[PDB]
């Protein structure tokens, strides 16, 4: 509905800057690291598969976690409780049928109690001051997809795949805004599947060029090439499915020619 498409994209560009986490929060976290963060987000991918949640739900939860951890120190033994609550809030915000609280307690193999999850939901809401409607990589890609000619499912699914992978690794992806990770992912997907590139209509829309996308693109291409050897594998497993046209089984390009 192009009547509001430009108003919406402009508003989300404003909000991604306000909802952005602190880039260097991991350093100030005494008891957790990027690796542990990586384990958690990889687990949230699994949960999202067990319960058939939207990809948008995963993205939002990660946003919430990163924002929560930008101001609250957490013990390692409580990281999964923050994560659990964030996924519950994300599900309540985004899902037609969110999973019930008992199901979230159960997926932590009773590491936590229902009361703990519920109390951690409140604190998370408090720390985020109820500002849950955050922009995601997902929300931007979906707009960028309207610019394919013609639409290509494989491109769409490989872009999502790539975007998902960027959730796992706070270094370096925390540096980049959702709209920029989306740009890199879309271009990478398109190049890989069709050899086309970041289209001119998206330059006009976003103001981004391949030049401005280069830094994120360079990281993302390395991530895509190293993906079979990454310690976390739930996203590759996921995208081997038919729902996603098996795009994790596609071969990444050895060079991007930039």
């Amino acid at each position: 509905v192009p009547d509001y498409h430009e108003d919406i994209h402009t508003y989300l560009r404003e909000m991604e800057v306000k909802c952005k986490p602190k880039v260097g929060y991991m350093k100030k976290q005494p008891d957790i690291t990027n690796s542990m963060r990586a384990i958690l987000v990889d687990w949230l991918v699994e949960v999202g598969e067990e319960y058939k949640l939207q990809n948008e739900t995963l993205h939002l939860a990660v946003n919430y976690i990163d924002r929560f951890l930008s101001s609250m120190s957490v013990l390692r033994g409580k990281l999964q409780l923050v994560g659990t609550a964030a996924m519950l809030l994300a599900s309540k915000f985004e899902e037609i049928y969110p999973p019930e609280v008992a199901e979230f307690v159960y997926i932590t193999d009773d590491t936590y109690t229902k009361k703990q999850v519920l109390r951690m939901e409140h604190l998370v809401l408090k720390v985020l001051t109820f500002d849950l409607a955050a922009p995601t990589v997902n929300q931007f890609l979906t707009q960028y997809f309207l610019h394919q000619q013609p639409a290509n499912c494989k491109v769409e699914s490989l872009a999502m795949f790539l975007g998902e992978l960027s959730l796992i690794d706070a270094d370096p992806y925390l540096k980049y805004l959702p709209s920029v990770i989306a740009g890199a992912a879309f271009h990478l997907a398109l190049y890989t599947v069709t050899g086309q590139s970041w289209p001119e209509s998206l330059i006009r829309k976003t103001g981004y060029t391949l030049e401005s996308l280069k830094p994120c693109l360079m990281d993302l291409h390395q991530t895509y090439l190293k993906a079979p050897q990454h310690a976390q594998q739930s996203i590759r497993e996921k995208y081997k499915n038919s729902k996603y046209h098996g795009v994790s089984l596609l071969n990444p390009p050895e060079t991007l020619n930039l």
Partner: peptide
């Protein structure tokens, strides 16, 4: 699955 806990 339990994560960072015992």
């Amino acid at each position: 699955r339990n994560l960072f806990g015992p």
